[PDB]
Amino acid sequence: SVGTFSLPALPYAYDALEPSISAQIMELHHSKHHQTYVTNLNNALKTYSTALAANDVPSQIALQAAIKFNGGGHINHSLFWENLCPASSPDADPASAPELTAEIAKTWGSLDKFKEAMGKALLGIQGSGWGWLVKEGSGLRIVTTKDQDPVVGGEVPVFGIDMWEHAYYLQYLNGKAAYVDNIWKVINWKTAEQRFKGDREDAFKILK
Amino acid sequence: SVGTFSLPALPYAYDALEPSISAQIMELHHSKHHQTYVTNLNNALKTYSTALAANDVPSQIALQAAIKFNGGGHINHSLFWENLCPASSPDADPASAPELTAEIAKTWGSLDKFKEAMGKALLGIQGSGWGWLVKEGSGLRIVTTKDQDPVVGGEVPVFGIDMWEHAYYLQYLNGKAAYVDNIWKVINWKTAEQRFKGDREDAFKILK
Amino acid sequence: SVGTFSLPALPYAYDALEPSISAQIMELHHSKHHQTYVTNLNNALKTYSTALAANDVPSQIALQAAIKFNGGGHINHSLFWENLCPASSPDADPASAPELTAEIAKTWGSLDKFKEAMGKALLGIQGSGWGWLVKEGSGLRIVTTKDQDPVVGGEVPVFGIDMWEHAYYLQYLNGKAAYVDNIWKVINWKTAEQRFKGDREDAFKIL
Amino acid sequence: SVGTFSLPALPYAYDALEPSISAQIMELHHSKHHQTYVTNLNNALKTYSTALAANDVPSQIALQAAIKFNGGGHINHSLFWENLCPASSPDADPASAPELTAEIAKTWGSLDKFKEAMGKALLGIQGSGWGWLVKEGSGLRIVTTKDQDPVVGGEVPVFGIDMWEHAYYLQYLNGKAAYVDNIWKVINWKTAEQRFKGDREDAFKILK
Ligand SMILES: [Mn+2]
Numbered sequence: 109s110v111g112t113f114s115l116p117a118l119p120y121a122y123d124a125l126e127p128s129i130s131a132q133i134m135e136l137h138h139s140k141h142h143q144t145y146v147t148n149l150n151n152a153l154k155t156y157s158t159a160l161a162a163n164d165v166p167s168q169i170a171l172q173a174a175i176k177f178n179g180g181g182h183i184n185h186s187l188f189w190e191n192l193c194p195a196s197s198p199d200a201d202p203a204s205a206p207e208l209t210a211e212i213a214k215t216w217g218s219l220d221k222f223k224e225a226m227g228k229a230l231l232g233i234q235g236s237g238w239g240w241l242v243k244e245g246s247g248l249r250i251v252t253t254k255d256q257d258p259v260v261g262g263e264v265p266v267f268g269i270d271m272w273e274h275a276y277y278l279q280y281l282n283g284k285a286a287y288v289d290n291i292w293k294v295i296n297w298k299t300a301e302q303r304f305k306g307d308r309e310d311a312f313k314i315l316k
Numbered sequence: 317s318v319g320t321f322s323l324p325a326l327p328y329a330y331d332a333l334e335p336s337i338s339a340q341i342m343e344l345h346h347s348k349h350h351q352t353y354v355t356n357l358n359n360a361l362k363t364y365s366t367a368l369a370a371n372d373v374p375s376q377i378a379l380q381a382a383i384k385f386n387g388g389g390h391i392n393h394s395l396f397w398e399n400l401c402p403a404s405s406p407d408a409d410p411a412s413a414p415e416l417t418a419e420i421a422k423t424w425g426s427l428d429k430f431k432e433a434m435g436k437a438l439l440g441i442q443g444s445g446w447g448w449l450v451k452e453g454s455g456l457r458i459v460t461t462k463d464q465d466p467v468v469g470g471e472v473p474v475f476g477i478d479m480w481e482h483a484y485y486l487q488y489l490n491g492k493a494a495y496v497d498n499i500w501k502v503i504n505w506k507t508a509e510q511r512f513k514g515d516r517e518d519a520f521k522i523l524k
Numbered sequence: 525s526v527g528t529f530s531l532p533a534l535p536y537a538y539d540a541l542e543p544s545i546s547a548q549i550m551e552l553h554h555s556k557h558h559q560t561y562v563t564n565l566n567n568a569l570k571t572y573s574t575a576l577a578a579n580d581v582p583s584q585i586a587l588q589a590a591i592k593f594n595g596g597g598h599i600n601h602s603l604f605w606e607n608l609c610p611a612s613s614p615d616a617d618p619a620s621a622p623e624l625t626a627e628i629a630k631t632w633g634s635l636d637k638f639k640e641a642m643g644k645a646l647l648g649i650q651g652s653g654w655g656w657l658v659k660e661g662s663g664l665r666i667v668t669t670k671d672q673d674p675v676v677g678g679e680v681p682v683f684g685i686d687m688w689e690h691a692y693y694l695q696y697l698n699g700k701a702a703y704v705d706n707i708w709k710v711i712n713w714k715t716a717e718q719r720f721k722g723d724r725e726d727a728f729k730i731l
Numbered sequence: 732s733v734g735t736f737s738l739p740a741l742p743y744a745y746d747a748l749e750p751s752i753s754a755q756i757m758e759l760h761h762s763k764h765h766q767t768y769v770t771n772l773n774n775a776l777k778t779y780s781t782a783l784a785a786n787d788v789p790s791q792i793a794l795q796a797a798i799k800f801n802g803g804g805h806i807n808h809s810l811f812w813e814n815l816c817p818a819s820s821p822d823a824d825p826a827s828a829p830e831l832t833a834e835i836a837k838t839w840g841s842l843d844k845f846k847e848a849m850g851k852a853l854l855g856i857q858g859s860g861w862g863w864l865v866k867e868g869s870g871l872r873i874v875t876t877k878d879q880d881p882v883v884g885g886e887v888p889v890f891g892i893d894m895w896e897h898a899y900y901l902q903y904l905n906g907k908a909a910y911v912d913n914i915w916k917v918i919n920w921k922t923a924e925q926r927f928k929g930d931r932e933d934a935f936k937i938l939k
Pocket residue numbers: 137141185270272274275
């Protein structure tokens with residue numbers, strides 16, 4: 109039936125990503141922001157099914173923003189929690205992603221240069237948005253999305269980093285550069301390797 | 317059933333709007349451009365139906381652009397044919413719309429000053445789009461929409477003028493100012509009066 | 525000389541808007557966020573000035589995003605500080621704005637109905653942006669702008685409310701509804717009345 | 732001094748791209764559309780010079796839409812005329828572009844599959860816009876731009892194809908598929924090769 113999504117539990121405790129991300133942020137981000145996206149996604153999808161069955165095209169178009177914003181919020185945050193892990197986990201080691209790092213090194217020259225390029229794109233976002241490493245065809249690309257827009261159909265998301273102010277402000281204030289510097293310690297490279305090796309449908313399987 | 321829209325017949329013959337709009341433009345515009353929007357709207361809606369029942373949010377979001385573009389294309393042209401009529405028809409006399417023209421005069425000063433204001437907005441559209449007279453509450457506003465974006469936000473559309481190049485190029489070449497000057501002769505003020513006196517749902521009944 | 529905008533001083537101390545807006549937010553909002561928009565605006569205008577003289581149109585177009593983002597950031601925040609004041613100030617009383625409130629009541633029915641309608645627009649902003657009460661001709665309208673986009677040429681801004689998360693998150697966390705409820709206590713209605721009675725050029729004289 | 736652009740002459744006669752593009756379109760496209768972009772760009776640049784000297788940031792921002800639209804119009808058409816040539820010319824032979832066609836074949840598999848992917852992107856444009864083959868770093872990409880937006884700062888334009896309806900409507904009516912199929916015969920692969928081997932400013936040297 110339509111609109112039966114639920115907030116996924118995190119793979120770790122709310123304080124497991126410290127000191128990179130504070131427990132307060134993880135709790136607010138998951139139990140408030142992501143929760144709201146889930147509930148509002150379900151509400152909009154059920155109303156949309158009514159508009160679709162009645163062939164009400166004006167209502168359908170008017171509902172697109174709520175589905176894109178809340179649907180994207182659910183897609184993006186679901187992907188986000190999964191490509192994070194405690195800094196002490198072996199999954200935080202890029203040696204967990206040999207195939208991905210090889211393609212990363214082939215594209216940007218080195219892992220450090222990819223990190224520099226992505227950091228630049230993350231800090232360059234005006235307003236709210238996300239930075240993504242994506243697979244397009246067989247090649248890798250850094251892309252940004254505004255607000256909660258999900259990665260555009262055709263690209264395989266490898267990992268994403270949330271640059272909305274609620275992802276860092278309580279801990280880093282306006283210092284988003286320090287936030288980006290610290291989040292590398294908690295990137296789940298095992299997850300990134302698995303997404304790089306699968307296709308679009310495989311990546312979105314966590315939503316199931 | 318989902319996605320069973322069909323192209324409505326015009327209220328007049330293809331040459332009935334001459335000399336303001338040529339028979340060739342009317343036939344191509346109706347039987348090709350509008351027909352394509354109808355067909356591609358129906359295709360997108362059937363695909364959407366599958367993704368909605370499967371709770372496939374990435375596909376639902378990816379389908380939004382086709383639904384808005386082709387759905388808006390169907391909405392906009394359906395309204396368009398109805399707010400046109402042969403220049404010799406009594407429906408082309410603005411005296412057919414006493415309440416609307418009085419409110420127009422209250423807002424812009426006179427019918428001529430509104431025509432100049434709407435003309436300016438139409439000629440100012442960069443690229444493809446539409447100009448609309450809309451009712452917001454009890455007041456009137458001139459708005460433009462890009463591409464085939466419809467006036468679906470809550471406003472009641474009173475009449476629209478298509479500024480896509482296919483609406484005039486074969487007859488007026490790049491002279492869109494001459495096209496706008498001549499379309500006033502075939503504006504259906506009887507239709508505009510009914511929309512001005514009705515609500516949002518009445519105006520969209522044309523889609524039935 | 526090109527690109528000499530500076531950070532305007534606030535009309536009050538950093539803690540003057542408590543309890544509606546904390547001193548910590550005011551100091552960060554003013555001394556870091558707004559200051560950054562000023563500096564990057566000046567940098568963008570200096571580069572643009574040469575690209576304009578060189579008839580280098582690709583550079584001019586490539587610089588537009590920084591000029592709109594940082595220029596709007598400077599415009600919006602400069603307007604913002606001026607239509608805020610301490611809650612006990614006489615300027616926080618809407619009786620300080622007789623002509624504006626009369627037109628507000630004529631348009632929305634009452635001041636409460638207008639506050640709710642603007643609240644709805646503020647809370648509906650997806651992502652970062654601003655809510656504005658503006659004058660177009662003789663009538664009032666509620667509009668929202670994305671990111672730091674300033675109010676569209678032709679409208680006179682009457683007052684604006686910042687809905688960027690940095691404007692409230694340290695104090696209200698995700699509770700933007702409570703932020704909006706409390707910011708009504710520190711709206712400067714004397715400033716709003718003055719903007720309502722002047723034109724677009726008047727409201728932009730503070731820069 | 733500011734705003735002294737002029738309409739460049741075509742590299743060939745108005746009928747030189749026939750039969751792919753008619754002389755009627757070439758003359759209107761060049762002497763009316765592109766000419767209007769030049770004139771309106773110069774006016775906007777002069778007005779900006781006034782707003783800049785007055786330290787008027789609101790007017791500067793309000794002027795951006797006219798500078799991007801007319802400045803982009805001038806850039807895109809200037810590049811466009813240069814990457815077209817008579818179909819019987821040796822420059823129309825893709826063998827004139829050995830390094831570029833090798834990178835195309837390495838990226839898309841063959842020239843025919845690249846033409847197929849670009850054709851799909853060109854026909855997929857909603858409203859007015861352009862399709863581009865661009866270079867980013869060492870890689871090739873098909874991108875589209877809306878209205879007269881020029882290619883995003885950072886990419887090197889290799890060649891563009893105008894999908895505004897004024898580019899084909901008089902000759903092909905709504906048949907943009909026939910227009911694209913025929914324009915391949917007049918693509919200047921000598922121009923494309925030179926741009927592929929140069930950088931961003933080299934490609935914009937045509938504006939001098
Ligand atoms: Mn988030």
